[PDB]
């Protein structure tokens, strides 16, 4: 485990909770440079905040980093409170982000988690209970909104 994992998941959960407060889906994340622990960006799901079909927590996080050179992505970790969907898996693959740390994969899991390993990326599931609890609360109280985010 990398020394910044605790920092990364803390920030990612902060983003998920902030997003929950604003009325949206409690999925957050951030991008951390593995060398020195700098936070390149952070964000949360913007489906309800901005009416966005594409701004998942992982995409929002990457957009909030701005355009980075390819070399930067190559030594980063992306932290996300929920297991990534097929789109966010593709983003991680496309940018070449070597490490993906997942809060939990209990309330949601896609084929992207294993496809990340197939494409050579390290996936870490921490099984964070704070993430599980906030995500389970949203699902339980707004289930119809929940199925829209995963395109069911």
Residues classed as catalytic: 58
| Part in contact with its own copies (CB under 8 A); list of ranges 14-22, 98-106, 110-118, 128-136 | 110-118
Q: How far apart are CA 26 and CA 44, in angstroms?
A: 7
For residue 22, state whether it binds its own copies (rule: CB under 8 A): no
- Write out the binding residues for Zn ion, residues 86-115 only, by CB under 5 A: 87-88
Least distance in angstroms from the C-beta of 123 to its own copies: 15
116 forms part of the interface with Zn ion (CB under 5 A): no
Q: Strands across the sheet with 28-33, in order?
A: 39-44, 28-33, 76-82, 99-104, 122-125
Nearer Cβ to its own copies (88/126): 88
Three-state DSSP class for 100? strand
Q: Which of 103, 106, 100 is nearest to 139 (CA)?
A: 106
Query: Which one of the spans 81-89, 100-108, 123-131, 134-142 is the region binding Zn ion (CB under 5 A)?
Result: 81-89
Euclidean distance between CA atoms 64 and 26, whole angstroms: 17
Q: Please enumerate in sequence order all residues whose Cβ is within 8 A of that of 144, keeping only pairs 6 or more positions apart, or say none.
A: none
> Rule CB under 8 A: is residue 89 a binding residue for its own copies?
yes
Give residues in contact with its own copies (CB under 8 A). 47, 51-54, 59, 62-63, 65-70, 85-91, 93-94, 110-112, 147-148, 150-152
């Amino acid at each position: 485990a990398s020394k910044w994992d605790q920092k990364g998941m803390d920030i990612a959960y902060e983003e998920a909770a902030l997003g929950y407060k604003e009325g949206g889906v409690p999925i957050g994340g951030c991008l951390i440079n593995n060398k020195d622990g700098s936070v390149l960006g952070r964000g949360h799901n913007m489906r309800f905040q901005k009416g966005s079909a594409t701004l998942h927590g992982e995409i929002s996080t990457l957009e909030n980093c701005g355009r980075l050179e390819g070399k930067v992505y190559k030594d980063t970790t992306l932290y996300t409170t929920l297991s990534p969907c097929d789109m966010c898996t593709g983003a991680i693959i496309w940018y070449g982000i070597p490490r993906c740390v997942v809060g939990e994969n209990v309330n949601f899991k896609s084929k992207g988690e294993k496809y990340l390993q197939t494409r050579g990326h390290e996936v870490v599931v921490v099984d964070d209970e704070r993430c599980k609890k906030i995500m389970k609360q949203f699902i339980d109280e707004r289930p119809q909104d929940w199925f829209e985010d995963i395109g069911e």
